[PDB]
């Protein structure tokens, strides 16, 4: 019966742990102990963007490194030009409880979702000057927590019914589902090649997923509490995570182990977002105590601090030319650092 | 400013005007969150408040003395709620409904009250408490078959308050029962408070016609007490 099944499972877990333990000859810090530091790094705020009425809950930058989108619970989406602080679009929603947004890589569409369990897709470039809903995807059984386009035809979602799905916009129907997680799925990150992706859940676990097969390829388990954020290192061979135990960590895909830990004893608040830099050297993170931190990714050092918000920091991101960082908080303000 | 500069400026200024009209309607309306279990009668309060007029959430609108209230009810979620609850950190009030004649599930309702009261993003929000189904409680107490102190051992040592109000000529036994169950929730709300939020209890049943007036009065008190704090230095 199930007693034997569980005993076999425990044996296989012992085998996996020993297979990983045989591979641990060196530590990253021993390899990098002969390296110069980066010194102190100091950033300043160039623009402050004003206009929302309630807490800002998500944002996303554009491939065109100039334009931006952001979402707020008063029920609005705004599209900004960040060189001039000069609003381009403002869009009113049907439900006020939104939690995610995303640009398409071509600048033709934006998307959003939230507490009603639907994904809605907006078309900006119509012959009409107006902006109207094109699609409403309607099959999930819990709220929508993240979202990322892949092209103008296909989109990937994660929800609070503990599944992720891949969707076909022109037809409207799901094409594949990913089911193995146990708690809510909180984030999601696409690969540079768009053939793999990773996710982390309200369960101290991350999984690597194959888009085209619809299967799980690997599982990574190092944290203590719910994982709130996740992202890929630039060459496609690594990823970093941050959770409610107030730690960030770096995992490697080929070695199949945890590789570096970034923490401190004075930090006892959870982490809301993480983000990498363009050469991979700086890892930037956001926290519940109103500030953001800058770590050297190779040394577990603490090379900088960004301050200036009054309420919880909820979102953060870096552009494709690597020039500037954008942050958003429960203040209802957005800020650009460089 | 050339062509593109001026056109982009004129466009962002029209957007500014429309956002100005939106701000006013947003600020003249009050949001409420409705909570309770399924053996509680929450929907009947929802229906009595309709004469004032496969989804994940439901809304009902009502108006009293020319003021507007929006009440929000959650349906079609899983039973784990430590994440979506955070969306509600800035409602005017929470409304908690309880089936008061069900002795066998009251400790679970008390645990719900404690978790809501002590959360980090919900610690400046006030609660209006409805103690529903009073005719059933009356019938049970008079019938004499079941006992409170089988579930709550300290009822043997309870005496009615002095400022109780048994006006309609009801039995003293029903009055002890009513006030004991009320004092249980008021003990939790006074233990860990800090002065930034309060609780407002009411006794009710299924044929009451006057719950919108009670909600009106309690929100008036809440908003006045908030005014006193934000504007000590005006």
């Amino acid at each position: 019966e199930l007693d034997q099944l569980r005993q076999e499972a425990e044996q296989l877990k012992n085998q996996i742990r020993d297979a990983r333990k045989a591979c641990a000859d060196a530590t990253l810090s021993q390899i990098t102990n002969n390296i110069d530091p980066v010194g102190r790094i100091q950033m300043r705020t160039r623009r402050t963007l004003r206009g929302h009425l309630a807490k800002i809950y998500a944002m996303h930058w554009g491939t065109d490194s100039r334009l931006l989108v952001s979402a707020s619970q008063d029920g609005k989406l705004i599209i900004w030009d960040s060189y001039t602080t000069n609003k381009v679009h403002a869009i009113p929603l049907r439900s006020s409880w939104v939690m995610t947004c995303a640009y398409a890589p071509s600048g033709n569409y934006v998307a959003c979702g939230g507490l009603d369990n639907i994904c809605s897709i907006y078309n900006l470039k119509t012959r009409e000057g107006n902006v109207r809903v094109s699609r409403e995807l309607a099959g999930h059984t819990g709220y929508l927590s993240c979202c990322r386009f892949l092209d103008d035809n296909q989109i990937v979602t994660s929800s609070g019914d503990t599944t992720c799905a891949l969707w076909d916009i022109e037809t409207g129907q799901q094409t594949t589902t990913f089911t193995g997680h146990t708690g809510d799925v909180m984030s999601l990150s696409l690969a540079p090649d768009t053939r793999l992706f990773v996710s982390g859940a309200c369960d101290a676990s991350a999984k690597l997923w194959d888009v085209r097969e619809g299967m799980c390829r690997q599982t990574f388990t190092g944290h203590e509490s719910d994982i709130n954020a996740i992202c890929f290192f630039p060459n496609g061979n690594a990823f970093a995570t941050g959770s409610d135990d107030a730690t960030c960590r770096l995992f490697d895909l080929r070695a199949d182990q945890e590789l570096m830990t970034y923490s401190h004893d004075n930090i006892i608040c959870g982490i809301t977002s993480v983000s990498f830099s363009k050469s991979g050297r700086l890892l930037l993170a956001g926290y519940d105590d109103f500030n953001c931190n800058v770590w050297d990714a190779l040394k577990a050092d603490r090379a900088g601090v960004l301050a200036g918000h009054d309420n919880r920091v909820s979102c953060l991101g870096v552009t494709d030319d690597g020039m500037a960082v954008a942050t958003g908080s429960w203040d209802s303000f957005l800020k650009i650092w460089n | 400013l050339s062509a593109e500069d001026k056109a982009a400026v004129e466009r962002s200024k029209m957007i500014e005007k429309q956002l100005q009209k939106d701000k006013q309607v947003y600020r003249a309306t009050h949001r409420l969150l409705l909570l309770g279990a399924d053996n509680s009668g929450k929907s009947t309060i929802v229906k009595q408040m309709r004469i004032y007029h496969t989804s994940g959430i439901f809304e009902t609108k009502f108006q009293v003395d020319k003021v507007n209230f929006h009440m929000f009810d959650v349906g079609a979620q899983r039973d784990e709620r430590r994440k979506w609850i955070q969306c509600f950190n800035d409602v005017t009030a929470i409304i908690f409904v309880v089936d008061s004649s069900d002795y066998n599930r009251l400790q679970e309702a008390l645990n719900d009250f404690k978790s809501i009261w002590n959360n980090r993003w919900l610690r400046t929000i006030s609660v209006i408490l409805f103690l529903n189904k009073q005719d059933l409680l009356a019938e049970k107490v008079l019938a004499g078959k079941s006992k409170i102190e089988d579930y709550f051992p300290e009822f043997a040592r309870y005496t009615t308050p002095e400022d109780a109000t048994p006006e309609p000529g009801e039995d003293p036994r029903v009055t002890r029962a009513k006030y004991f169950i009320r004092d249980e929730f008021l003990r939790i709300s006074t233990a860990s408070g800090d002065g930034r939020h309060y609780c407002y209890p009411h006794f009710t049943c299924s044929v009451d016609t006057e719950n919108a007036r009670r909600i009106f009065n309690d929100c008036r008190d809440i908003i006045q007490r908030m005014h006193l704090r934000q504007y000590e230095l005006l």
Partner: nanobody, 127 residues
């Protein structure tokens, strides 16, 4: 990997006594608040008892308030419950539960149907 393994159950005649223990692994034991829950035949999950980070504040449900006792040991990573006078109504499965986050006062979702930081359970039969 977070693990909680709980043991001590079995068959008792009414009026007897019993002791249960949990061994924890995979988290820093002392930042967390700990709980005991149980499930009887034909019902749902029900909250039994409660202890906080240091052991100073304790809490019990109404029907076991004079009979059961809860304690913890942070140097051995262990949790304990002791049960003194058992009744036929105590026949159930017992589970050991953890609070979701550290340094926190509220305790959400610990009796839900699926929950990630709960163990496998132990059977207790009184007759």
């Amino acid at each position: 990997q977070v693990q909680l393994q709980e043991s001590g159950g079995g068959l008792v005649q009414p009026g007897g006594s019993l002791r249960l223990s949990c061994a924890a692994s995979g988290f820093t034991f002392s930042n967390y608040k700990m709980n005991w829950v149980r499930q009887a035949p034909g019902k749902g999950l029900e909250w039994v008892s409660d202890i906080s980070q240091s052991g100073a504040s304790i809490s019990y449900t109404g029907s076991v308030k004079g009979r059961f006792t809860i304690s913890r040991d942070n140097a051995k990573n262990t949790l304990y419950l002791q049960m003194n006078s058992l009744k036929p109504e105590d026949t159930a499965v017992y589970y050991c539960a953890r609070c979701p986050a550290p340094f926190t006062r509220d305790c959400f979702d610990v009796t839900s149907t699926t929950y990630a930081y709960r163990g496998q359970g132990t059977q207790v039969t009184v007759s």
